[PDB]
């Protein structure tokens, strides 16, 4: 399977997650958040080693609201976009909806509020891997390829300026 190899190439050095728990699940949710942070910081450190340090994320105390920044390089210019998402109650079986609010109504591949629209292959890929993928995988497999299409398009169309 080309799809299976492409997925492994992108995520194989990201720690896999284990716990099936969402925000209402008490000590199991605290454990899931340990897994989320361990997977995210390993992904960040890998990214720095690859000269591709392309995001920062923080959460609120309960880990239910996430926010931060991503950066995209086009023609050597660096573009920054604020990002945010809420954790669904049925996470991790359900994937979170990443919003880039400053691009709301600027890309056709987006919903109201700046929620990014991924391709239809993302959702079954997440579903098949539950509960192994977490927020690091959402960034690597969801937002990262979305930026690599949409940011060059919007710069060419004169919709985004540096």
Curated annotation (Swiss-Prot):
Changing residue 51 to A: Decreased ribosome ufmylation. Changing residue 31 to A: Does not affect neither UBA5-binding nor thioester formation with UFM1. The active site is at residue 117. Gene3D superfamilies: Ubiquitin Conjugating Enzyme (3.10.110.10). Signal peptide: none annotated. Keywords: Disease variant, Isopeptide bond, Ubl conjugation, Ubl conjugation pathway. The keyword Ubl conjugation applies. Changing residue 111 to A: Decreased UFM1 transfer. Changing residue 109 to A: Abolished ufmylation. InterPro entries: UBQ-conjugating_enzyme/RWD (IPR016135), Ufc1 (IPR014806). GO terms for biological process: brain development; protein K69-linked ufmylation; protein ufmylation; regulation of type II interferon production; response to endoplasmic reticulum stress; reticulophagy. Interacts with UBA5 (via C-terminus). Interacts with UFL1. Interacts with UFM1. Interacts with KIRREL3. It is linked to Neurodevelopmental disorder with spasticity and poor growth: An autosomal recessive disorder apparent soon after birth or in early infancy. NEDSG is characterized by axial hypotonia, delayed psychomotor development, poor feeding, failure to thrive, peripheral spasticity with hyperreflexia, poor overall growth, and microcephaly in most patients. Additional variable features include contractures, facial dysmorphisms, and ocular movement abnormalities. In absence of UBA5, the active site is solvated by water molecules thereby reducing its nucleophilic activity. A linker region of UBA5 is required to reduce the amount of water molecules in the vicinity of the active site and elevate its nucleophilic activity. This is Ubiquitin-fold modifier-conjugating enzyme 1. It comes from Homo sapiens. The lineage of its organism: Eukaryota, Metazoa, Chordata, Craniata, Vertebrata.
């Amino acid at each position: 399977s080309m799809a299976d190899e492409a997925t492994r190439r992108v995520v194989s050095e990201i720690p896999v997650l284990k716990t099936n728990a969402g925000p209402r699940d008490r000590e199991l949710w605290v454990q899931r958040l340990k897994e989320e942070y361990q997977s995210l910081i390993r992904y960040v450190e890998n990214n720095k080693n690859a000269d591709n340090d392309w995001f920062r994320l923080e959460s609120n105390k309960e880990g239910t609201r996430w926010f931060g920044k991503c950066w995209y390089i086009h023609d050597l210019l660096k573009y920054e976009f604020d990002i945010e998402f809420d954790i669904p109650i049925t996470y991790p079986t359900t994937a979170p909806e990443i919003a880039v609010p400053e691009l709301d109504g600027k890309s056709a591949k987006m919903y109201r509020g700046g929620k990014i629209e991924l391709t239809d292959h993302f959702k079954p890929l997440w579903a098949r891997n539950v509960p192994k993928f977490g927020l690091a995988h959402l960034m690597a497999l969801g937002l990262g390829p979305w930026l690599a299409v949409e940011i060059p398009d919007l710069i060419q169309k004169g919709v985004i300026h540096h």
